[model samples]
Target: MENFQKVEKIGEGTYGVVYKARNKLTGEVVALKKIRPSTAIREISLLKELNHPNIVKLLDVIHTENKLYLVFEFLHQDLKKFMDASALTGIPLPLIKSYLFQLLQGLAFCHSHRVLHRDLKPQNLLINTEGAIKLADFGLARAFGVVVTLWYRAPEILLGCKYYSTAVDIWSLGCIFAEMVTRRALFPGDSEIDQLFRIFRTLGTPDEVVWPGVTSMPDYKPSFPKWARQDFSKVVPPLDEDGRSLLSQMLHYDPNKRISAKAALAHPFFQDVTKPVPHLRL
Candidate 1:
């Protein structure tokens, strides 16, 4: 308990509050994820077993009965900050490609193990000083059935589907991929229906033809607007041909047809990305 000094409450994590802390002895900055209960225990069990360069490292676990303090290597930047910075001062297209490719690398590892990061968004993706992306905030992440930020949710999850695949994460990643280019949420919806409307307005309403089984979805309504898909290049001028193709693949209406994390890593969009992506001090 005396090892580190609390710097500031870093605000809400998925399940509990987080903190920016400084090691009293080493003076190194670190993040303390104080888990009160529930998913608190789930992640320690999962995160402890997980390891990858792109996945945020779980340094140590501090637990006392019902409470736990998760020690994580803190990275000062996140993809959301980059999105904001892109709007103010343009970011290089290659950097966007680099970030997205690394995101897929970590996600591929998760999906390969059959784990699903049910909640994935720009804020949840931590970017290090050396320009590598690390997936974080596992409180809402699951090995199974879904949830996502409304803005980043796949149609299946937004429509309240119970039996979903890791494809939900793919949709969120897709949304993030585009937002990285456009500097705005691909679909910013306040409610369930609104999210669908926004998605349909941009990508067109899904149907049995395009999305084989969407017709039977519990939330499917015929009254939904039937907008046609927009040209991806027109919406995100920063995207090249491969980038546009890769983004659209992840946004597939059918969860089953959506690109897998592993598949995304092999997408042509990342062909030019540097090998063994750079690292920052842990």
Candidate 2:
């Protein structure tokens, strides 16, 4: 507290208030989060072990008699705020491809480290003016666990599958990809049941044939309405065929069928992005 100057309150989460601050000695801007002891342990423990360009960096930690502050490198904005400013017309295809590529790169790094970023949403993704995207917020991340937001949660988790895997993050990434093209949430459900149904409505209701072992889930029940699968083009009008195909694979009914983050990075949708950009001649 003595070495940093509070700029302003930037955000508030289930853990605590986040403040924009400047380091007194170096004048470097940073996000200072005042988290509860319980939450701080998880956030700090995971972030300390993660070191990647596509992932948010934890700079320092401060402890007081009654408080714990975790300092992070400041990002210009989050994907949610960036999308809101787009005014719903949707982001450009090239930019969308770049952002998603960076996102998967980060996820691939985390998955390779055996870390599960249980929460994956636009709000949790930070972006800089350079169009670089970094994955943030490790409060809910774990080596292995059933923790995620309702709208972004995987089908296996929705059915009470406890020992899930990296595929869960892929499902959330699929939802975020659709939102990036549409500039709106793909599934904005009010509750757990509604969220599950919302996913079924878009991808069609899953049966035992599509999701083997789904019936064995503790909470699995066959009560959802059968919805005809909606075309990806209709749902994400701006996404190209290659993008749609990748999204479909990511949002597959069975976790086993979902595309892995590393595999997604090599998908054809990013082929254009990987090609050398033509130099501008004045």
Superposing all C-alpha atoms, what RMSD in Å does each candidate have to the true structure? 3.3, 4.1
- Leading candidate by lDDT: 2
Tell me the spans in candidate 2 whose CA falls farther than 4 Å from its real position: 37-43, 143-149, 274-282
The C-alpha TM-scores of every prediction are: 0.88, 0.89
Q: Best candidate per TM-score, number? A: 2
In order, how many clashes per candidate? 0, 0
lDDT of each: 0.78, 0.80
In candidate 2, which residue pairs clash? none
Model 2 Cα lDDT, one tens digit per residue, 39-60? 6455566667688989898887
In model 2, how many backbone clashes occur? 0
Question: What is candidate 2's TM-score against the reference?
Answer: 0.89
Report the error of model 1 at residue 2, Å: 4.1
